[PDB]
């Protein structure tokens, strides 16, 4: 009932961890993406976005 992007925001961490199974993708950056993807600010800010929208 919500944006798939938001839902995929979590499912993305799965694909990332799947592609990172190649080795040639320093999990450093891959993980770094998780810190932002799993960032709370995303929801905190996303909340405002919806409010304004």
């Amino acid at each position: 009932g919500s944006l798939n992007l938001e839902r995929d925001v979590q499912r993305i961490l799965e694909l990332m961890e799947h592609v990172q199974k190649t080795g040639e993708v320093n999990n450093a950056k891959l993980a770094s993406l998780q810190q932002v993807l799993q960032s709370e600010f995303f929801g905190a800010v996303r909340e405002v976005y919806e409010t304004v929208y």
């Binding site: 799947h18 592609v19 040639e24 932002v36």
Partner: protein, 54 residues
């Protein structure tokens, strides 16, 4: 706006690593006018958090 870039930045390295075009696309699609737009709307303060004392 470099912190957010670090998110997709991983994709920059995946450019060499042949991964699932779908998976890699997930990180790409993760950059929309909603999310990536919010990052640039939040990174504003994040970057200001350390306002160059200069």
């Amino acid at each position: 706006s470099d912190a957010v870039q670090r998110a997709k930045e991983v994709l920059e390295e995946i450019s060499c690593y042949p991964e699932n075009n779908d998976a890699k696309e997930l990180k790409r699609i993760l950059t929309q006018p909603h999310f990536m737009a919010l990052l640039q709307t939040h990174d504003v303060v994040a970057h200001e958090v350390y306002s160059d004392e200069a």
